[model samples]
Target: EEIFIGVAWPFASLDDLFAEGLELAVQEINEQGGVQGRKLSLVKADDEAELEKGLAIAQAFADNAGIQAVIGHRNSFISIPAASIYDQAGLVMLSPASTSPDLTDHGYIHVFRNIPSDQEIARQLAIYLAEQGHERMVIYYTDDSYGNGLANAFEDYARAQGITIVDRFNYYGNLKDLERLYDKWQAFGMDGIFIAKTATGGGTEFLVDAKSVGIEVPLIAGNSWDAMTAEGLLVGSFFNPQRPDSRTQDFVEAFRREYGQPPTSYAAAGYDAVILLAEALEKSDLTHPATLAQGLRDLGPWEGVMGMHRFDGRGDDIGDLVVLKKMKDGRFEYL
Candidate 1:
């Protein structure tokens, strides 16, 4: 059986941890002889942070090749259109990281997210912030679907918790002008800054930029922020993560042993995407795409490093979300 897994996100880049994570998982799986004796092949295309480009890639994947499934487009805007394309073609679209609340409810039968949705993180963070006495807060978001949706969820819950949203700033994907946005909110004397995004480039840049501007407010971010650097994670910052379990740690350790560095959360998701798909492929009849979808829906409980994960009725994974606290050394310890 031939498997054409469409990877529409990064392969591996020092700039983006998710991409690097994807590469690690692919490498590890290929080393273990691939999914049930069928050599795994990845038909990768870059989303480049554009929804149209991602949709085009999905279209091309559906039209040109005998594609079996998809494994990426971690961007929700990109994934949303791509999901529509895949559902029309009956190709299963599995996301390693796209976490918008609306993906499952989009009426697409084939869309699946291994990462927990943003609303879950917002719920957790809202409570955490209130517990930490963060009444005054500012929100910085990426202005895309993933960022905006997460920001909205966070804001909703924060308001419910009686936290004052001093300012809400929206910026484009690259976050090049984040300093201007930061400066505008700095005077608000915000007790906390909420970063509602899962951007490849802009996510980490926001935190680093905050430190550069002398804004010492406690930082709280969605599960999307991965590159938690030492100076970047201030003394009292928190972030929700799509974390890994014991199995995930095994994969991380193995990858680190091979490359002398720990695998990022995104890498674990990438590894798990293929693992989940492969597991489903083993149990289903790949001759029909719908069979594969059934197998995935029936995957009930995957003891993934990201926890016992599986898709709900809406095709989104039910586990893997975590609220993490940034330690002084920049390591994200789960809360």
Candidate 2:
């Protein structure tokens, strides 16, 4: 017997890392006799991080009877819209890295995610930043679904904690005036800046420009910062969900051995998403969406590399399971 799962990613350098993690889980599960004697086959689609393309890919997967479930559409922009598409098709869509709070707010029965939502991620980061004596901050975010969602969440949480938001800047396209924007915000007497975005439109370009101008304010960012290529540039910056357990350590070792690089948090989330879905498949009929969806909900607290994989009735992960970490000497050192 065989089961098929489709993955929709941007198909870029970083997105390939997520695919690698998915493949690792598929290989390990197949080697272990698969779920209930059925081999799992992975299908790939490149959404290009565009909502239109993501919806198209979702429709394609829905049209294919062989694809029982989907495991991607990394960006919140794509994943949010794609969720509706998959829901209308009565297919399951699990995301490894989409974090917009609005994704779950839509109440899609078929949509679920393994990573923490941006609301919780921002709440934790805001608390840590306020604790660090940073009173004022400026926000720079891409003008997109993910950027706006996370930036709004972070600002709301930060303000609730008595942290002042000096100003906010939006970045679009090439962002050629990042230096000018940084200077303008710094003039407001900001002690730090929060960047809300993933790899799109050069997520860390403003940081590069900030460094070029000798701006030394501490930096805080969304979870996508974990997968950003400009790591060394953000030293002394902070982010959340950095807690590591023994299971995660083992996964990190295995990922490094296979990929020859440290596993980003996104990679770990991808591995857990596939593994958890397989566990659900073993307990329910793959042909029935309601049964499979309930089976996933009834799985209880699943112990995975990223920690407990539990979901509420609304398909949102419960609680805030994040840890603050700061980059020092080009490495994330826990706070």
Candidate 3:
């Protein structure tokens, strides 16, 4: 029997452009002959930018399809509910974008992250702030699992690292009252600000508002800002996981040539996720979900488009470059 993979994402958001790249990767892999000569098929569903929708869709997939594995959830909030369903059902679900450390803390072996843990990102951001000699830092984050967890983790880590957090603010995913928030930041005398929000229209709105409000402090943020909307609007902000390299450029070109548009890491990661599942299935019996999970853990350092991709103990990704990036002239460049 051929291996089947299930994919999920917030397919309706502004950052949904990344899904196009994922589809291209799937088509290319299938055309080149799928894993172990099996035709690779992509099964996908949209979260519609809502957690409940994602949970319901994921449960539906788990109940009907014998899908060996599923990759999903750009939003950590969605991941929380969706992952719970996947875990109870014993499906290995890998996330390319969900970064909240809380997900992994739940101790579910089935859920994995291609990106570093959110707590690790927060700890690093805290250290980077102290190294820059910043004494007072401010935080403004969305009030979701990803944002709230990141903000709290950053504060806890920053305090331990001997930094004083001046002000911590909250906003919903929609950054409506950004100007009022900016006023509060101005009064807080914060020398550095850390932003942790999902990729959406709000990210750009916040960036533009921050620039207009004259809050020139260095902005430190997380990997969730990996989408075009975040990069396009985040001018002069210090970011993480350095920009893609020449090798990535080559892949992007070839992918566009194949699909008539650029690819996003989500697509590439999702593509790789399917291929990885296939390789694992080849070495083990798919009838045994545990065996497939073991095969994944056993698969030695596999090289793909993401470069040196593999799983760690906590199901978090490591061994990839995580350098900081900055936005200049409507584009993100490595800092």
Candidate 4:
């Protein structure tokens, strides 16, 4: 018998990255005799990270009684609304990528995630910046839920750390506007620039613009930053609270063996989400949504490659998930 878990994300990324991680977890689990002799099977749906399609995928997974849980719909806007669909349909929605803090605030018992939300990541970045001696900086964020959430949390925590926010901007992919930002920063002195991230390629566009304008202070960002872009541009910048250290070495080793290359945090998180469900299955009666939620909490602290997997009452990862790193020599070297 097979136990199905819906896995959703941008289909284009499925072959190489996130889906690979999920597939490896399932392969390993099934090899070891899957949970209760029921092999973990994934029912994948790709929404291109779009909203309408993500809702449709969510509805289909919820409609199917066989799929008791799900892995994602990457961006927060899609994942946030989709959570309610799963909540009403009595299915567990576990997001691996969406870090918007509002994702778990709805009090939805069936909702869980394998990674820390913006509350921790952005706050940790702010603290990292404060400790690194960065003072005044302009915050540039995309005008959306994910952007707003990270920008808000970063400011809230950065201010608490006694860091001055020179000004906050809403970015909408306009290069001229970014040019103006650099001009303003020049007129008014700044120690760094904090960009509330985007999965969209505008971040690459921004870095190109930044390099051209000669804005050389640290270009800081949250965890969702584009590393390949940063590495390609050869632009060194610091991002918050995550790196491939001892906590990830074992998983990283297995991942490289399986995929024949290194893994990103997104891939690692996808692996953790599936393994987390398998962990819960062994500990509790996950026959229903309510029970699944309770089982997740009652399973107690788990030692995951993502660090100590301890979910607080709200199902947020409340463990040690932060490590400061700067991109140097085309690598994210720990700072």
Q: Say which candidate scores most in lDDT.
A: 2
lDDT on C-alpha atoms for all candidate structures: 0.71, 0.76, 0.67, 0.75
lDDT tens digits, residue span 153-243, model 2? 8899999888999988775344446556656777777898788756446656666666666667777776666653344333212122344
The C-alpha stretches of model 3 lying farther than 4 A from their native spots are: 131-133, 143-145, 160-162, 171-189, 199-205, 228-250, 321-323
Candidate number that wins on lDDT, 2 or 3: 2
What is the C-alpha lDDT profile of model 1 across 56-147, one tens digit per residue? 89899777546778887777767877888888888888987777788888788888988777777687778877987888898877776566
For residue 264, give model 4's deviation from the true position in Å: 1.6
Positional deviation of residue 227's Cα in model 1 after best superposition, in angstroms: 3.8
TM-score of each predicted structure versus truth = 0.79, 0.85, 0.80, 0.89
| Model 2: CA > 4 A from native | 12-16, 143-145, 171-189, 197-199, 228-244, 319-323
lDDT at 319 for candidate 4? Answer: 72
Best by TM-score: 4
Under the 3 Å rule for N, CA and C atoms, how many clashes does model 4 have? 1
After superposition on all C-alphas, the RMSD of every candidate to the true structure, in Å, is 4.8, 3.6, 4.3, 3.3
Worst 10 residues of 2 by lDDT: 232-241
Candidate 1 pairs with clashing backbones: 21-267, 245-305, 248-305
Candidate 4: TM-score?
Answer: 0.89
